[PDB]
Design a protein around this ligand. Structure first.
Ligand SMILES: [Li+]
Ligand SMILES: [Li+]
Ligand SMILES: [Li+]
Length: 173
């Protein structure tokens, strides 16, 4: 068996994390994990709301749920948050970025209401996730990836697959 790396795909909802992670998993063999889906599957919530009519994700339980698998390596994690993940989990972190105009159209198409649209659009224009990533991990392993069109998705997949290949070689001497 090969020692495999762990990758974090983060960024504002709508930037294309899920589409990228799923394609990466299919073309690399690594396991893709959507944190939101995982919390829903294992019911890792604590608290509700009237605000957005959605249960509140239990960060500590999410970490406990994934730790053993992360320790073993070979996981692509997808989430619009990253400050609560143990720093040791990831070998590289990609913050997907989408032009505000493009992101708005995507989220609107997803059926986001005015409130959710504004909250997420400001999250992106304020570069919240990029800042969160740089504050949570060493800047040398944090990279912003443009994600506005199929062409950039393709460039991202290609660059990450090549990164994975080099990493596996360097860490399985
Ligand atoms: Li937390
Ligand atoms: Li650094
Ligand atoms: Li950049």
């Amino acid at each position: 068996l090969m020692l495999l790396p762990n990758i974090l795909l983060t960024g504002t909802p709508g930037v294309g994390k899920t589409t990228l992670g799923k394609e990466l998993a299919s073309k690399s063999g690594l396991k893709y994990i959507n944190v939101g889906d995982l919390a829903r599957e294992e019911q890792l919530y604590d608290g509700y709301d009237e605000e957005y009519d959605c249960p509140i994700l239990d960060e500590d339980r999410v970490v406990d749920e994934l730790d053993n698998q992360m320790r073993e390596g070979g996981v692509i994690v997808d989430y619009h948050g990253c400050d609560f993940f143990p720093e040791r989990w990831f070998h590289i972190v990609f913050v997907l970025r989408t032009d505000t105009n493009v992101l708005y159209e995507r989220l609107e198409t997803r059926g986001y209401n005015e409130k959710k649209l504004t909250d997420n659009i400001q999250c992106e224009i304020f570069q919240v996730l990029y800042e969160e990533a740089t504050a949570s991990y060493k800047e040398e392993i944090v990279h912003q990836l443009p994600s506005n069109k199929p062409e950039e998705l393709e460039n991202n997949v290609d660059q990450i697959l090549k990164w994975i290949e080099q990493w596996i070689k360097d860490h399985n001497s």
